[PDB]
């Protein structure tokens, strides 16, 4: 049938342009990532303003909590908030995964207290708390009970 | 099936767009296996998208943890 092939060809141009751009953007983030500077690497992705690149980056760093430093949380937490409001369920889950890692790794010590880093980190966590209040979000609400 | 091929191309593209590149490659590879002058063009275009997901996968794996 000719219509089904026409169905396939419609979305091709979009796919090609989207995958090429994200690949360029990923190359930029990886060129900084290979420096060893995780923070500037994530700051680079955020500056690129491409959320799909932030999701790919978070899926990577979320696998190793020992890569996270307190400084990185002040950059990530605004993205988590962005991701928690996404229409895509996979974007929301990446946000929950990252937020869990931050809560479990960093919420103590942040409580026990650079003081500005904890101060900034805490207010970011407070606005996210409000968002989670209004499943993954139920568990997160229990995790942010403070 | 004709529809099944249109089905799996949509899945490949949906997975590629959402960052599930591993799942996307599986649907991209399966569709390519199942695949008249315009039909040859369709295969070339899907083969291009497939190699692009592969190149993205190669870049993501180059992130050393």
Q: Briefly, what is this?
A:
The complex is a heterodimer of chains A (146) and B (65). Chain A has 146 residues and is mainly alpha-helical. Helix content of chain A is 80%, strand content 0%.
Order of helices and strands of chain B: HHH
Q: Biggest interface and which pair forms it?
A: A-B, 32 and 29 residues
How many individual domains of chain B?
1
Measured between the Cα atoms of the first and last residue of chain A, the distance is 61 Å
Query: In what range is the share of β-strand residues of chain B?
Result: under 5%
Assembly classification: heterodimer
SSE series of chain A: HHHHHHHH
Structural class computed from helices and strand pairing of chain B: mainly alpha
* CATH level-4 homologous superfamily of chain B: Phosphotransferase system, lactose/cellobiose-type IIA subunit
User: Per the principal axes of the C-alpha atoms, what is the gross shape of chain A?
Assistant: globular
Number of strands of chain A: 0
Distance between the terminal alpha carbons of chain B, to the nearest Å?
42 Å
Biggest sheet statistics of chain B: none
**What is the number of helices of chain A?**
8
- Total number of helices of chain B: 3
Portion in helices of chain B: over 70%
Indicate the proportion of strand residues of chain A: under 5%
Q: Which topology of chain B does CATH recognise?
A: Methane Monooxygenase Hydroxylase, Chain G, domain 1
Q: Please write the CATH class name of chain B.
A: Mainly Alpha
Secondary structure category of chain A? mainly alpha
């Amino acid at each position: 049938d000719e219509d089904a092939m026409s169905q396939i060809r419609k979305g091709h141009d979009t796919m090609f342009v989207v995958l090429t751009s994200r690949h360029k953007n990923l190359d930029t983030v990886r060129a900084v990532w290979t420096t060893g500077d995780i923070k500037t690497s994530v700051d680079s992705a955020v500056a690129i303003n491409d959320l799909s690149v932030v999701v790919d980056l978070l899926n990577i760093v979320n696998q190793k909590a020992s890569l996270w430093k307190l400084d990185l949380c002040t950059t990530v937490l605004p993205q988590i908030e962005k991701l928690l409001q996404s229409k895509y369920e996979s974007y929301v889950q990446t946000g929950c995964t990252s937020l869990k890692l931050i809560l479990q790794r960093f919420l103590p010590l942040i409580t026990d207290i650079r003081l500005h880093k904890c101060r900034l980190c805490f207010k970011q966590l407070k606005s996210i708390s409000g968002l989670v209040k209004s499943s993954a979000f139920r568990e997160l609400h229990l995790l942010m009970a403070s | 099936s004709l529809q099944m091929i249109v089905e799996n191309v949509k899945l490949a593209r949906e997975y590629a767009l959402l960052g599930n590149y591993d799942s996307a490659m599986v649907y991209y590879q399966g569709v390519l296996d199942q695949m008249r002058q315009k039909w040859q063009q369709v295969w070339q275009e899907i083969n291009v998208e497939a190699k692009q997901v592969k190149d993205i996968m190669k870049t993501l794996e180059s992130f050393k943890l």
